[PDB]
Amino acid sequence: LCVIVQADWNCPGWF
């Protein structure tokens, strides 16, 4: 979701 850690298809970084 464009944050920091974890995969996030919206943008690397879920939280």
Residue 11: helix, strand or coil by DSSP? Answer: coil
| CA separation, residue 15 to residues 2, 4, 8, 9, 11 (Å) | 8, 5, 9, 13, 11
Experimental method: NMR
Name the maximum alpha-carbon separation found in the chain.
13
DSSP 1-15: --SSSS--TTSS---
What does DSSP assign to residue 14?
A: -
State the first-to-last Cα distance of the chain, in angstroms, to the nearest integer: 7
Whole-angstrom distance, CA of residue 13 vs CA of residue 15: 6
Task: Give SS3 for 2.
Answer: coil
